Design an enzyme around this catalytic site. Structure first.
Site, PDB file in Angstrom:
ATOM      1  N   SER A  76       0.779  -1.228   0.049  1.00  0.00           N
ATOM      2  CA  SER A  76       0.021   0.018   0.115  1.00  0.00           C
ATOM      3  C   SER A  76       0.865   1.309  -0.085  1.00  0.00           C
ATOM      4  O   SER A  76       1.601   1.491  -1.011  1.00  0.00           O
ATOM      5  CB  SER A  76      -0.903   0.072   1.262  1.00  0.00           C
ATOM      6  OG  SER A  76      -1.655   1.055   1.152  1.00  0.00           O
ATOM      7  N   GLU A 126     -10.012  -4.394  -5.401  1.00  0.00           N
ATOM      8  CA  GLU A 126      -9.055  -3.190  -4.715  1.00  0.00           C
ATOM      9  C   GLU A 126      -9.642  -1.713  -5.496  1.00  0.00           C
ATOM     10  O   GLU A 126      -9.429  -1.605  -6.760  1.00  0.00           O
ATOM     11  CB  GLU A 126      -7.814  -3.464  -4.741  1.00  0.00           C
ATOM     12  CG  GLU A 126      -7.101  -4.600  -4.092  1.00  0.00           C
ATOM     13  CD  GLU A 126      -5.844  -4.416  -3.344  1.00  0.00           C
ATOM     14  OE1 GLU A 126      -5.317  -3.156  -3.301  1.00  0.00           O
ATOM     15  OE2 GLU A 126      -5.143  -5.282  -3.751  1.00  0.00           O
ATOM     16  N   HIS A 137      -7.331  -5.984  -0.603  1.00  0.00           N
ATOM     17  CA  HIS A 137      -6.077  -5.002  -0.295  1.00  0.00           C
ATOM     18  C   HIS A 137      -5.009  -5.798   0.537  1.00  0.00           C
ATOM     19  O   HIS A 137      -5.507  -6.050   1.505  1.00  0.00           O
ATOM     20  CB  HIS A 137      -6.537  -3.869   0.189  1.00  0.00           C
ATOM     21  CG  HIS A 137      -5.470  -2.787   0.097  1.00  0.00           C
ATOM     22  ND1 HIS A 137      -4.810  -2.378  -0.931  1.00  0.00           N
ATOM     23  CD2 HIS A 137      -4.966  -1.826   1.086  1.00  0.00           C
ATOM     24  CE1 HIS A 137      -3.903  -1.467  -0.489  1.00  0.00           C
ATOM     25  NE2 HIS A 137      -4.042  -1.095   0.500  1.00  0.00           N
TER      26      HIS A 137
END
Length: 297
Positions: free
Chosen positions: A145, A239, A269
């Site tokens: 991320s 996502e 995610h």
């Protein structure tokens, strides 16, 4: 051992999302992330040395018989949360399935320190890590991320400064477009029970702090990605940030970088965190490591 059918697990992340707290104080959301992410399993035989890099805190990790390879790792957490701790679950596995010393960096979080604080630490650490490692050739950068955005961000900042490029970059569901405006962002928003709409919003807001959202070092997807080393990217299908993974692959691609993208069906995610329940979590880790070590070889 037993596992969850991907979808059911999604149903789980969905239920958890609903009961999620309305407006949780950032300091608590953090403490509960530590408490929560502590119930998760850490790879066996991975000693956790509490050390540092460039004056930036970090939990080094390695097995007894680890090679000379190195993985400088940046955790995820919307640039406003997360810690080397919280991600032991993933990194311990990374460090073990690749027989490499992994350095999980504790870069500063916002709002206490907005851009370019974090990016800065990632560079400093790398700089330090070069000396220790001896050669930029036995190092690899990775993160999930936001941590995925820094693995690129820091390398662009490093290229600027003049440091040699690592052997490779591994990103998990990279967060690289803080404008939150591409296809997946709206089309899959519903499906993402982790990187939520309102979530990313304040996430971005706080990190950006007055600065420009399209600043290349903030949303690499607008940079001159030229010169960067090969990069491997894994991302789940469920996502909102899916388009970051594809758009950064496109640009870096056209930018002349070597890129390998894999989009995993029914995965959320940063699914590599949920090996405990979903099989792909493991397949991915295994593939990410086969990739890493092959480069450092």
């Amino acid at each position: 051992d037993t596992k969850m059918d991907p979808r059911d697990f999604l149903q789980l992340l969905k239920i958890n999302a609903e009961k999620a707290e309305k407006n949780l104080p950032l300091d608590q959301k953090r403490a509960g992330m530590e408490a929560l992410c502590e119930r998760f399993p850490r790879a066996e035989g991975v000693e956790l040395t509490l050390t540092d890099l460039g004056g930036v805190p970090c939990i080094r990790q390695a097995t007894d018989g680890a090679g000379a390879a190195h993985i400088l790792y940046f955790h995820g957490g919307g640039y406003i949360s997360g810690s080397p701790s919280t991600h032991l679950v993933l990194t311990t596995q990374l460090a073990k399935q690749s027989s490499a010393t992994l350095w999980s960096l504790d870069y500063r979080l916002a709002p206490e320190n907005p851009f370019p604080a974090a990016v800065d630490d990632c560079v400093a650490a790398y700089r330090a890590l070069l000396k220790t490692a001896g050669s930029a050739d036995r190092i690899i950068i990775a993160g999930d991320s936001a941590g995925g955005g820094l693995t690129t961000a820091s390398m662009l900042k490093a290229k600027e400064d003049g440091l040699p490029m690592p052997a490779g970059l591994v990103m998990l569901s990279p967060f690289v477009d803080l404008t939150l405006s591409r296809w997946s962002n709206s089309n899959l928003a519903d499906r993402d029970f982790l990187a939520e709409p309102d979530t990313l919003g304040e996430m971005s807001e706080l990190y950006v702090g007055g600065e420009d959202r399209k600043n290349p070092l903030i949303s690499p997807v607008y940079a001159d990605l030229s010169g960067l080393p090969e990069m491997l990217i894994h991302v789940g299908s469920e996502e909102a940030l899916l388009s970051d993974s594809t758009t950064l692959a496109e640009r870096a691609g056209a930018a002349g970088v070597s890129v390998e993208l894999k989009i995993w069906p029914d995965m959320p995610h940063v699914f590599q965190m949920y090996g405990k329940f979903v099989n792909a979590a493991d397949i991915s880790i295994k593939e990410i490591c086969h990739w890493i070590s092959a480069r450092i070889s």
